[PDB]
Nucleic acid binder design. Structure first.
Ligand SMILES: [K+]
Ligand SMILES: [K+]
Ligand SMILES: [K+]
Ligand SMILES: [K+]
Ligand SMILES: [K+]
Ligand SMILES: [K+]
Ligand SMILES: [K+]
Ligand SMILES: [K+]
Ligand SMILES: [Mg+2]
Ligand SMILES: [Mg+2]
Ligand SMILES: [Mg+2]
Ligand SMILES: [Mg+2]
Ligand SMILES: [Mg+2]
Ligand SMILES: [Mg+2]
Ligand SMILES: [Mg+2]
Ligand SMILES: [Mg+2]
Ligand SMILES: [Mg+2]
Ligand SMILES: [Mg+2]
Ligand SMILES: [Mg+2]
Ligand SMILES: [Mg+2]
Ligand SMILES: [Mg+2]
Lengths: 89, 126, 95, 245, 106, 68, 31
RNA sequence: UCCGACUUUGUGAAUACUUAUUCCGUGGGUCGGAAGUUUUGGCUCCAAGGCCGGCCGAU
RNA sequence: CGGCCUGCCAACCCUGGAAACGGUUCAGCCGGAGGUAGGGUCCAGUGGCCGGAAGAGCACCGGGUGUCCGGUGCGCCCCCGGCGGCCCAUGAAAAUCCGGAGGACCGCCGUUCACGCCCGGUCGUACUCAUAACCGCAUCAGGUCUC
RNA sequence: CUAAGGGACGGGGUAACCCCGGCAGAUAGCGCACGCGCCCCGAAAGGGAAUCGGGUUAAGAUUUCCCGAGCC
């Protein structure tokens, strides 16, 4: 409805090229999404600025990715740091 | 079962927030005026001050003084501790209330001089 | 096997859900067991364990989230803590 | 001719950095006895935005080691840090993301950021958003450590140098297309007077070595000696190769 | 319709030059200069408003200009921390202190 | 300016040393007694005709009295 | 007197604030 | 601007040293040798105590 | 300007314990981390009444009369409140003022209370602000920041 | 009062005029002997002690004079 494929990117009209609009689409969606708060258990985490993710209700503010709360390498880094910490013992 | 007369509590709200008190009477079910469970407590409005050997005799007598308050507190405004202070209290007007406060002050000042219950007279830091 | 036993307590026993009613049952010593979610606020968690130590009530730390609790109890809202006051035909207490 | 634009930036007149709304230098706390021998706990109070910096900064409060005072710090925030979190700095700090450790305490393969080059530098390496260094190896004889920098270069650092555990927050920032001259205008408005660049071929010969001609063309090789004087050193400087491989 | 003029030599509509229209007993309209809207006291741990204190310009809170009951709240950390913040600190102070004793025994 | 409600408090204020004059203003409803003190002008409204007269006669003899 | 008691302070890295020490050898003297 | 000589420029072993020089850090706040605090977004200062102004507590 | 009342929209408190889920905005959104409901606290106003103050001002009649009662709104201007959106943009500082933690020290001495007494320097201030008071050699169809 | 910024003690450079402010130099002092110790200029649109109504001149006062009423 209202659009067959543009979605959030229809605000850009006919400008900038179809491939660039398709490129920006995933980050426009992800940066405006609501994320799960591990501290309180609600989907209330919103981007306050690039890298800054604040929960609406519990008030926790977390440092994360530019356009998504958790980057892929952040999970990988945490697992590497956790394995190094345990094997250190 | 741990909210009984003689048990020590901490007030969490109000004018005496953060003060230590002892339970005197428990209305577990609550009266008609107060449907909720509540207790009568006797607390320290002014803690006895730090008493040290270097002090003179008159000064350490002034530092050992306490002030006592009487208050009815909702159960939800109380942090129940594991400590116990028994001084045989067994307890309306603005004259009866203040007189009863002075009696508890004499008993609590005497307990403090005994040296026991050091936690009860040593304030809380927050 | 704790999700099934908790599922049976909601079907036949008596319980209460939520912080304020968990504290009330501890004050009146009606709860037989306290269950805490793993993301329950650390100040809140400490106070409930201290209340349970004042009485003689056991506390179990639920293996999952506060979203997972409540779902285990078959409700569509989150549950931070649970208090069991009657299991009836459930062996949750003896474990 | 006249002084070219590349030369005029060193005077720093209109080319000074825009820093009026910046929150202060981001760096470790000064190295002291407690960090050198044990650990010190601070609490994260805010995660804030710094204009011109992609990565968020973390406000941390410590207790002063010997004065009855608060000690407030501000460094680059590692990804995953949050407000109300306890961070620990020092030799005996646990290997956890957000903690500040000497490199001697980080095993091989650890991901680190804001790495000191000299002991007490307060952090020199891997500070931009999404960047990190990797611990490669340890030398106990010389007391040095080998780390891998974001550019790929290996570097030898003293094992007493401090680094934070984790990678810098805000990664993925440059994958998003800017799409607009105006978005680029706002980016550089809070950084420097550099954004709208005029091509040297679009100039007159008085202003640029590339200027002039009846067609826009350089007219000589754009690769230039490393030792060329300022005003002459434009184009690709000391290039070992050109073109797209 | 009785258009108005500024009454001082400030000629620019800045936030410090905000006016209101009043009717005088002389039957005319004049400008009166108002005070900028001010936040009241705020709690540093919750960010919420501090109950019991009015929202004034900082110099209107001066002791010679404001009564003492209006300036304060009768509780520890009265005008600084809210009630929820004070309750949490009392509970945290006591519960962590008990843990220190338990660490010592164990 | 401040209002006084009970008659006796107006009596003590008119007896103050810093009180200078009393103005009596007649309205179609009541009678206003205004005593000019150092900082404030105090007004008392008397809705009764005889109470106004009793107040008039009982004023301190040292204070000036004016009819408005 | 039972009121008198010891109140020791443990001077660790993150312990009680230390008392005044000599600090003479670490003084930054005039040029 | 690169490059060489002299000067700054010293000492000792068959390359080492540190005090010149250079760089970095700190409110110059635990350096050298020996002897013998992970806790929950809370508070932490101006010593209690012991023994003769003095010493330990605080090698 | 002072006193009393009122108490928006948010925020907070106490009781209680919600699925047959409910409450709710133009939009949102909110609730076992405690909703709906019931009862309260605070907040701001350029809100109401009284004092100021009808003695003033205004309009009439020759000293006198009057200065009263309602209704309405996607109306216009200013201010405030509370939501939503946006940023690889996150949008001053300091003086100044208030509050708080602690409790060394102190008794006929403390008092941020009311009322009472005295004092308040220097310089600017007229007028124009424009198709004639400014610049454009001018009393120039130009140019010159605002309510 | 501070903003962007400007000047400037010591020190450094410079034949001198003059050019350099973070390069740290016993920082030139503050409370009650004892204790502590990390320059100025720059906004009549930024921040900011405290005023209102009515009257008055040929010419002032869009809050300065008069009347009354307040405030700092
Ligand atoms: K030239
Ligand atoms: K430009
Ligand atoms: K270009
Ligand atoms: K050319
Ligand atoms: K108040
Ligand atoms: K004038
Ligand atoms: K003209
Ligand atoms: K000004
Ligand atoms: Mg051309
Ligand atoms: Mg040329
Ligand atoms: Mg209600
Ligand atoms: Mg009136
Ligand atoms: Mg009239
Ligand atoms: Mg307009
Ligand atoms: Mg106090
Ligand atoms: Mg100044
Ligand atoms: Mg400046
Ligand atoms: Mg000089
Ligand atoms: Mg100035
Ligand atoms: Mg101004
Ligand atoms: Mg005039």
């Amino acid at each position: 409805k209202r659009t067959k494929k543009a979605g959030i990117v229809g605000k850009y009209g006919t400008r900038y090229g179809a491939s660039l609009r398709k490129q920006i689409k995933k980050m426009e969606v992800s940066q405006h999404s609501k994320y799960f708060c591990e501290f309180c258990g609600k989907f209330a985490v919103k981007r306050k600025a690039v890298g800054i993710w604040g929960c609406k209700d519990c008030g926790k503010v977390k440092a994360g990715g530019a356009y998504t709360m958790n980057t892929a390498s952040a999970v990988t880094v945490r697992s590497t740091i956790r394995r190094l910490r345990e094997q250190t013992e | 079962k741990f909210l009984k007369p003689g048990k020590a509590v901490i007030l969490l709200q109000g004018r005496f927030a953060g003060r230590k008190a002892v339970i005197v009477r428990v209305f577990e079910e609550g009266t008609r005026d107060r449907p909720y469970g509540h207790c009568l407590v006797a607390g320290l409005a002014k803690y006895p001050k730090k008493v040290i050997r270097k002090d003179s005799a008159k000064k350490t007598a002034k530092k050992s003084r306490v002030k006592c308050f009487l208050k009815l507190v909702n159960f939800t405004h109380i942090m129940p501790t594991r400590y116990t202070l028994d001084v045989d209290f067994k307890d309306a007007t603005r004259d009866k209330k203040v007189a009863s406060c002075k009696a508890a002050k004499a008993r609590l000042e005497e307990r403090f001089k005994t040296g026991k219950n050091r936690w009860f007279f040593t304030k809380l830091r927050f | 096997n704790i999700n099934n036993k908790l599922q049976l307590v909601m079907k036949s026993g008596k319980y209460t859900l939520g912080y304020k009613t968990v504290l009330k049952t501890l004050r009146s010593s009606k709860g037989k067991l306290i269950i805490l979610a793993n993301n329950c606020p650390p100040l809140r968690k400490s106070e409930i364990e201290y209340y349970a130590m004042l009485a003689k009530i056991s506390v179990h730390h639920f293996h999952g989230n506060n979203v997972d609790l409540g779902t285990a109890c078959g409700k569509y809202y989150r549950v931070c803590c649970l208090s069991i006051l009657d299991p009836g035909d459930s062996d949750i207490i003896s474990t | 001719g006249r002084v070219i634009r590349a030369q005029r930036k060193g005077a720093g007149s209109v080319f000074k950095s825009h820093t009026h709304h910046r929150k202060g230098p981001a760096r470790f706390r000064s190295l002291d006895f407690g960090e050198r021998n044990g650990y010190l706990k601070g609490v994260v109070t805010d995660v804030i935005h710094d204009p011109g910096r992609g990565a968020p900064l973390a406000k941390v409060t410590f207790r002063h080691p010997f004065r009855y005072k608060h000690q407030k710090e501000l460094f680059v925030a590692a990804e995953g840090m949050y407000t109300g979190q306890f961070v620990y700095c020092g030799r005996r700090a646990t290997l956890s993301v957000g903690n500040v450790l000497p490199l001697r305490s980080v095993p091989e393969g650890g991901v680190i950021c804001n790495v000191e080059h000299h002991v007490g530098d307060r952090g020199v390496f891997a500070r931009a958003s999404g960047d990190y260094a990797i611990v490669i190896s340890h030398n106990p004889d010389n007391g040095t450590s080998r780390i891998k920098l974001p550019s790929g270069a290996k570097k030898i650092v003293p094992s007493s140098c401090r680094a934070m555990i984790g990678q810098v927050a805000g990664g993925g920032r440059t994958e998003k297309p800017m799409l607009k001259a105006g978005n680029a205008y706002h980016k550089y408005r809070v950084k420097r007077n550099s954004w709208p660049k005029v091509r040297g071929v679009a100039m007159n010969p008085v202003e640029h070595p590339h200027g002039g001609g009846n067609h826009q063309h350089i007219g000589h090789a754009s690769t230039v000696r490393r030792d060329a004087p300022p005003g002459q050193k434009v184009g690709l400087i000391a290039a070992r190769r050109t073109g797209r491989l | 319709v009785q258009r108005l003029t500024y009454r001082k030599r400030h000629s620019y509509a800045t936030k410090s030059n905000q006016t209101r229209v009043v009717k005088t007993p002389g039957g005319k309209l004049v400008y009166q200069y108002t005070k900028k809207r001010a936040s009241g006291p705020k709690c540093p741990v919750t960010g919420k408003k501090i109950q019991g204190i009015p929202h004034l310009r900082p110099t209107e809170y001066k002791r010679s200009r404001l009564s003492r009951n209006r300036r304060t709240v009768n509780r520890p950390y009265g005008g600084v921390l809210s009630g929820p913040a004070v309750r949490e600190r009392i509970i945290r102070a006591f519960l962590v202190e008990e843990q220190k004793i338990v660490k010592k025994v164990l | 300016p401040k209002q006084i409600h009970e008659i006796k408090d107006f009596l003590l204020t008119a007896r103050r040393k810093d009180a200078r004059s009393v103005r009596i203003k007649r309205t179609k409803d009541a009678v206003k007694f205004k005593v000019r003190c150092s900082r404030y002008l105090y007004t008392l409204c008397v809705h009764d005709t005889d109470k106004a007269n009793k107040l008039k006669q009982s004023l301190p003899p040292g204070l000036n009295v004016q009819e408005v | 007197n039972p009121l008198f008691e010891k109140r020791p302070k443990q001077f660790g890295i993150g312990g009680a604030l230390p008392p005044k020490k000599d600090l003479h050898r670490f003084v930054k003297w005039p040029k």
